[PDB]
Amino acid sequence: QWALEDFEIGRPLGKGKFGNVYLAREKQSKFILALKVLFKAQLEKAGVEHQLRREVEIQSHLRHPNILRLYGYFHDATRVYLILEYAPLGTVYRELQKLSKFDEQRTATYITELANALSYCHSKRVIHRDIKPENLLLGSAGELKIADFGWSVHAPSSRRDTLCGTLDYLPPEMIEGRMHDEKVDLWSLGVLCYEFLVGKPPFEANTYQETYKRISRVEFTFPDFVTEGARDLISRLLKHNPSQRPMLREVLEHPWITANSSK
Ligand SMILES: N#Cc1ccccc1Nc1ccnc(Nc2ccc(C(=O)O)cc2)n1
Structure with missing residues (x-):
């Protein structure tokens, strides 16, 4: 040992x-x-x-x-x-701090990366994976690594969002106190994506209540710059009905990922 x-x-x-x-x-x-x-x-x-x-x-x-x-x-x-x-x-979180927003090739590849992982995990009968920026690490050269697992750790930066970063990555079924399945992770994905491109998450707000509202009511808008195929992807990702969300296949198939993905 x-x-x-x-x-x-x-x-x-x-x-x-x-x-x-x-x-x-x-x-x-x-x-x-x-x-x-x-x-x-x-x-x-x-x-x-x-x-x-x-x-x-x-x-x-x-x-x-x-x-x-x-x-x-x-x-x-x-x-x-x-x-x-x-x-x-x-952590991708710090990177996001630095660059303020990511670009499409970055996002799309990270997203590819993420989806590969979950797919693999799913096959191992693993789900629920909590992947917000601060749980995601950057390996040797460029990669993306799901840390998850151990109760989340922090390296000093921001002060801002301390907790109050929690809810944004939770799907309506989790926060609503219902059950959940492999489909949670597809919501998350849709949320990561949006944040990657936006610099903020889709549901960000001043109170947990209003955050909660927007989440469960799926009320989220894109700023100017997002591209239709980007919209299409997150949109098809963040659907109140878990069933209406893809499996990872169509994610990795999606016209806009394959376009801007380096992977
Ligand atoms: N998840 C996670 C996590 C979040 C914050 C800090 C550490 C975490 N866990 C692990 C584990 C192995 N390598 C690394 N690599 C790493 C490398 C550099 C930093 C940093 O410069 O600040 C932080 C982490 N992190």
């Missing part, structure tokens, strides 16, 4: 509520990874141990270029430790 003793520790990459990810490397190989740390005292008090202990064993087996891989795991006494793949470029 492994222990904290096989790792050198660099900066914390980000700091979560139940713990942090630090930059790390195995001591022999000097091969770099990321160490997610979890207080476990902070943990069970949220009721999560036994569900974490399986939910590691999904993200352990999962393997894919656009999914951040979990190499191994260990606990000690007071802390739980996820050995993670390191993503050099960090």
